[PDB]
Amino acid sequence: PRLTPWKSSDEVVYLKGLFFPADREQISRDELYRQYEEAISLVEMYSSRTRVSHILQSTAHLFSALMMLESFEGLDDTVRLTASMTIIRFVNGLLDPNLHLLAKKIDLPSLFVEFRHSATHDALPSLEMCKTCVDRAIDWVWDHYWDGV
Amino acid sequence: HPRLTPWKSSDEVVYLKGLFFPADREQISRDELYRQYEEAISLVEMYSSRTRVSHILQSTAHLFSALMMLESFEGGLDDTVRLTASMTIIRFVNGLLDPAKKIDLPSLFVEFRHSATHDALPSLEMCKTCVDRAIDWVWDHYWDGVLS
Amino acid sequence: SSNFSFDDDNTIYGHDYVIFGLKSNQNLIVKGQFVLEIQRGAIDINGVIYHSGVEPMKFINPSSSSIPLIQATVLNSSLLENKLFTPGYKSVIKLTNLDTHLESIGRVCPLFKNLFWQFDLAFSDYTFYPITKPDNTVSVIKHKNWMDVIKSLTELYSNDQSIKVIVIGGKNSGKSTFLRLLVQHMLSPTLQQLPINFMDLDPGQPEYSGTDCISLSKISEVQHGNHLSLTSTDSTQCHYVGFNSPKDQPTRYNLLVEQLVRSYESDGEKHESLLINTPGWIKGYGLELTRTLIERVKPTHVIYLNSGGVDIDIPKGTNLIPLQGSSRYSSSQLRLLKTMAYFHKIDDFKFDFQPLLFSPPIQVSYGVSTGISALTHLKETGIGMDHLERSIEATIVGIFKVKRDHLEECLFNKGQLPLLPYKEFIKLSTEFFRLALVHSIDQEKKIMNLYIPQFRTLDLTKEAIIMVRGNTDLPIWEIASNEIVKRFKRQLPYITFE
Amino acid sequence: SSNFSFDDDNTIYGHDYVIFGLKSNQNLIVKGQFVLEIQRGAIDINGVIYHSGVEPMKFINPSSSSIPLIQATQVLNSSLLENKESQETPGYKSVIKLTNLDTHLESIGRVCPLFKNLFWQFDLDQYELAFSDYTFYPITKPDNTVSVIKHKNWMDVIKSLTELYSNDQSIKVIVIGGKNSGKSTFLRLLVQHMLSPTLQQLPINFMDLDPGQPEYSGTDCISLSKISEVQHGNHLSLTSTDSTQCHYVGFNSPKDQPTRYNLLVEQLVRSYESDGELKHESLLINTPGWIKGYGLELTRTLIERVKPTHVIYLNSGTLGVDIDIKGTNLIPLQGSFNHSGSRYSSSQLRLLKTMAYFHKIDDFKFDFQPLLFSPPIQVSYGVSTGISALTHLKETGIGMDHLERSIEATIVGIFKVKRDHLEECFNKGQLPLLPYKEFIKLSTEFFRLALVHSIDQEKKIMNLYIPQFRTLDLTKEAIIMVRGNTDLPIWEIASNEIVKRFKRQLPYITF
């Protein structure tokens, strides 16, 4: 009988509804980020109660990165760094289950592995590339975890 | 034999030394100190636009932006600031070690990299300590040496 | 393949107690829980000698830890008056059954039943079981260096006045066995009897401190087994870090260690000798924490449990000892046992391990009223006001005590549970009371339901109890023990099936 | 140790040209710059048959690249050959004549001491009799120069694709490979094969979406070029090869501005479909050095964007899983093999491709004296019609006092914006700084890259060193300026000829 931070499993459904209201068109651009903020707060509350599965915490981090990368209009270095770190943490936690064959086995696409290496060992990836990688990973979590629940 | 530097006449490194690390660290106003910090980050961005800058100088620019963010935190969702400071430390340390602690890098930075990359996200206080340690490190190893 | 001496027709089987007459060349290892009195002779256990005259001493040694050898090796001045039909051999040990109500962990936990005394030639069934035939159970055996280094502190304890000692090592280095040996060595009734002052600064794997305590404990009596923090020695205060490791809040941990060293210096500068445990960190920021600690304490000795080290060399005198060390089967899983047995104790050496639900629970009001004035979240303080109230529920929070003038402070939102900001929390002084497990919370009635192990009604005048949620986790066995998955229909209050 | 048949061919030295009479087995590997016609027979060069009648061809084969074989093995089998004989011909196979190019591009040792022997004029006592010094001469004795020859499958795929160009139906091609995989050699071979004299003289449409290692394109361009005349050597993108437009990405790699890169590629593909639908122009594409990751994603997006009708991959790997097998070919890398000293690094040869851009008087005239002595071509700044605004492509956030210093002594692209498109939206002010966000929306035509020298602050006038250029006469088309990522070679800021000339503390260099 494993422990769940949420009282019922129904709050996972509500958390998915906040992340993915599924009426993406058409809703207000600031209502979507009002749902995203409530969902990030629920994720951090669940994390404070008990450990959360890496996908759920990662979805919170990636949605925070999405809000900052969409709200951004100046000195872009910190916005670059936040999304960069979010993607590196997401990819590393996904891969930290035990190198090219490993990415195919976990089904993580190649652009993420290149993004992590470029951010760790090379110059900061372009903010336009950070948007691409964040949206790709947010699609990844839908493709793997969130659709089933 | 000649090498290319983005700064004209190579006296603006002296300017960045005083602009990052002003003469007085406590009598100066913190708002004006952060204005000086922001100006130095803007100059480092300009030199990056001109050409490649030494990894120490880019790391100084990133670390002081992270410092300004951490010390000006008003509370709330600290997910952003923790992630940004963790990434700044990771870039700094990796760029140092990319080309044992022979470089005199403290074990705090290497432990911070493992904590942020693989382990749970480092806390705000730990990031504040690590960024200040890095800012001291770059000063001692590069910034004090350069003079006029 | 450790074994103990086996005697036939010499030992006597008695009701509630067993007496063994050990020959001169005999040794005993005993698994379980037993009060150990000495009838005739002197029994030197774990490197220190105990005679017949000493008062009876109670052992709690589980399967996870190594069993302390009970040697018969002999003659000393009296003093110790030996006190049975036959004199037999030189030494006659008397083992008393200790009704500690352990072995009841099996009711809630399936695997933990094998740690303590449980039966699962002719041998009766008691809470102490001597391992006559050789088994896989380990015994406390330490290198001669381990013994003489820890004994060199005892001679300097014998004369005036006090010593400050540090222990540094990794999580698996074995600082716990070392520190228990040292207290056993100085508190032996063959030297100065004044109580040692023990400072335990490790929240992850603490001893003489409940889960998530920084605790300065004046140890007056010996804990002769690897007590799991179950038995309490009179300690001035716990300090609830709330986190498994000092990494999570380095500033809170530092300000708390510094404030504990204040009382340590006030009571040690008073002939009592100070003694410190340090976290499992030897790498990274932990080395810096240890260095900062050494500078402040100015210890007379320092002990490191490995080889590596240069930073520690400055400036306090440093000793190098090999790690050695040792089932549990996991050390982090033993943290859950130490958390659970805290809530299940009526009094020390008595543990009723039926789930806490069935027992009448406790009421408090999370309002301006004197019940609980405020709540504060360590770590993530950005929890939404509407979400903190559900965040605390069904977790093990730590309730504090504050002065009314300090209690005034600024709490933030009167509605539901008033959150007290962490920034205001750190500034004001707090006195830890007890760890609280909150059963449920009534939104409409504003009265929330919590379980705490034992308490003195918290009688006080406008002493606002402040609740604190750390990082410490709730053992699954309290919400979903197999007893309360069948006594109440399998539902999902916080638990889900695999 | 490649070598050719020594001669000993009754060759006459001439003054500016050399006459060669090659036997049937004779072949040539020639290092240097030279132009050749054929006086007798049909010389076969790198897998195509060139007879005597074909117009003279111009060779820029560099020491960095491999040397195209010049065979005379193929016996003249067609009447298209037009042989003119003024000497001797004598019935000994075929005689070909090659003339000095005099491109003056060899004079690079003036700026760089390492770029010597890339373009040879014998840079050491003479060891052979009757030796002569020209801008060209074949290596009679064996030497460490790789020749242009590949496995029979490499030439077989290209040849098989070639007769598919012989008939009416048109061919669109994709080429995919990593850096040093050999995409450049593959494309030069394929373009040489499609423009053989036997095939119709119908110009190929060549699309080059590679900014880092471009071909038929100056440094940091995306370029579509209708190639009507083949470039018989590794012209380091230093020949005209008339192109419709050279699109300034401004960056070494796609990753820096992926959205601008994709928009530019899609626009260039649309411009190619304006003319590739006509079916005369066989469209052909190069792809960036990225073989995996987001580069593979860009390649797949291109493949679904341009109806491929052919795809070539240079390395075997996860491409077959990633790219649906829709016909694609598989050819092994067979990358050019040479020493780093002989074959300079891609980042070290981008500096040459950038320097020779500003130092070219014409297509084949190269004056490599430092640019400082030439007139700075003063231009205006501000709201003035000369040059209006500045756009930093990536580092958009820059202090409004700092961009003017930023563009000083750096390579910037001068664009063209017509009518009020520039008016769409800072402070002018020292410099307007048109934002990048409004830049992307506006349509721009790329004028030649500009080298900035000595920004003047007291006056809006700023010096601009740009290569050969017609007068920028525009009714209202304001020529805005942009700064990308393109690097500035040291040799045009501080070479020996100007460091020794001055020796004082120069502004942007340290010693």
Numbering used by the authors:
A (entry chain D): 5 to 77, 79 to 103, 112 to 162
B (entry chain C): 4 to 102, 116 to 164
C (entry chain B): 60 to 132, 134 to 143, 151 to 187, 203 to 351, 353 to 391, 394 to 411, 417 to 500, 502 to 589
D (entry chain A): 60 to 147, 153 to 187, 198 to 399, 401 to 500, 503 to 588
Passage from the reporting paper:
A HEPN (higher eukaryote and prokaryote nucleotide binding) nuclease Las1 and a polynucleotide kinase Grc3 assemble into a tetramerase responsible for rRNA maturation. Las1 and Grc3 are highly conserved proteins and have recently been identified as core enzymes involved in processing and removing ITS2 spacer, which is a key step in the synthesis of 60S ribosomal subunit. Recent studies have demonstrated that Las1 is an endoribonuclease that contains a HEPN (higher eukaryote and prokaryote nucleotide binding) domain responsible for rRNA processing.
Cleavage assay indicates that ScGrc3 can activate ScLas1 nuclease well for ITS2 cleavage, while CjGrc3 exhibits relatively weak activation ability for CjLas1 nuclease. To better understand the differences in the mechanisms of Grc3 activation of Las1 between different species, we also solved the cryo-EM and crystal structures of full-length CjLas1-Grc3 complex at 3.39 Å and 3.39 Å resolution, respectively. In addition, His130 in the ScLas1-Grc3 complex active site and the analogous His130 in the CjLas1-Grc3 complex active site adopt two different conformations, which are similar to the conformations of His142 of CtGrc3-bound CtLas1 in two different active states. This observation may also provide a structural rationale for the activation of ScLas1 and CtLas1 by Grc3, as well as for the fairly weak activation of CjLas1 by CjGrc3.
